[PDB]
Amino acid sequence: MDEATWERMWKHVAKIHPDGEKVAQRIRGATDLPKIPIPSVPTFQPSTPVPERLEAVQRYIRELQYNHTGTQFFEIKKSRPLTGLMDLAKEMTKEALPIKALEAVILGIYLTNSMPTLERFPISFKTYFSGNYFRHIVLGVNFAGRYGALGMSRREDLMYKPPAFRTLSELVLDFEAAYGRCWHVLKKVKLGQSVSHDPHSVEQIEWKHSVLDVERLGRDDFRKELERHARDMRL
Amino acid sequence: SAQQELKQRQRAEIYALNRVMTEL
């Protein structure tokens, strides 16, 4: 990154960290800092079952670390054609910097395009906690009729899910329960369509094909609308 | 090469910062 963005990051650090400038004083120019290995982009034998591949993909995502610096290192324009987002995903693997939820979704797509028997679709959440709204996103996946997820979160139970849920409803209800355990109220769920496995596709990701108002729908219509989206995807 | 060196120095400082911010 350029001089200007670099100084912007450290200026931001000074305002949000309590010790402020002393963090920058310790780190900037320090000579014996840990060398961070560049995480190895996972590659897969054809004998390896898809669920085991998903474990390796998620391990790679986790190795990059959640970005707590306050500065996003990759700009993600969500309307960009898939081929452009996949160029960005490659750049993410080469620069190997910390990431947040949306970056992990793009990486998850990039690293599973080699899995045509796996369907991938974004799942975004809108939640409410302590008078404020929060947004989060994961990459929902479907293998052999079971649902799981890839992603990046501050919390362990708001990202990776092995593909073992029998319905999309059960997957989303598991996220809702995890949010409840962190005292968030789940307000909306936005579900995208399946993403092409062609990394040179020029079509856009459809992020918000279904928008579910959890509170207005109620338990049974919530599940029914989730079942409808799953049907929409099997086309 | 000066470019790669600059990016590697930045990356090492980014991760050192990320640990500090994670611990906070």
Domain ranges in chain A?
1-235
**CB atoms closer than 10 angstroms to residue A47:** 6
By what technique were these coordinates determined? X-ray
> How far apart are the CA of B12 and the nearest CA of chain A, in angstroms?
6
**Residue A37 to residue A152: CA distance in whole angstroms:** 20
> How far apart are the CA of B5 and the nearest CA of chain A, in angstroms?
12
Q: Could you identify the residue written with the tokens 């990051």?
A: A9
In a 3-state reduction of DSSP, which class is residue A123?
A: strand
Q: Which residues pair with A141 in a beta bridge?
A: A120, A148
Contacts of B13 in chain A (CB under 8 A): 27-28, 30, 33
**Residue A88 to residue A79: CA distance in whole angstroms:** 13
**CB atoms closer than 10 angstroms to residue A41:** 14
**CB atoms closer than 10 angstroms to residue A54:** 24
Find which of B3, B6, B8, B21 to mutate to test the A interface (most A CBs within 10 Å of its CB).
B21
Where would I find the H helices in chain A?
A: 3-16, 21-27, 50-64, 82-95, 101-112, 168-181, 214-233
Q: Which residues of A80-102 are buried (b: 16+ CB within 10 A; e: fewer)?
A: bebeebbebbeebbebbbbbbbb
**Residue A117 to residue A21: CA distance in whole angstroms:** 50
User: Could you give the C-alpha distances from A45 to A49, A54, A104, A195, A200, in angstroms and in order?
Assistant: 9, 13, 23, 23, 23
User: Could you give the C-alpha distances from A128 to A114, A134, A181, A184, A215, in angstroms and in order?
Assistant: 37, 6, 13, 5, 12
Q: Which residues pair with A204 in a beta bridge?
A: A81
Q: What is the stated resolution of the deposited model, in angstroms?
A: 2.0
> How far apart are the CA of A37 and the nearest CA of chain B, in angstroms?
10
Q: Could you identify the residue written with the tokens 């090469």?
A: B1
**Residue A93 to residue A145: CA distance in whole angstroms:** 30
Find which of B10, B17, B24 to mutate to test the A interface (most A CBs within 10 Å of its CB).
B17
Pick the closest to residue A135 from A230, A58, A211 (CA basis).
A211
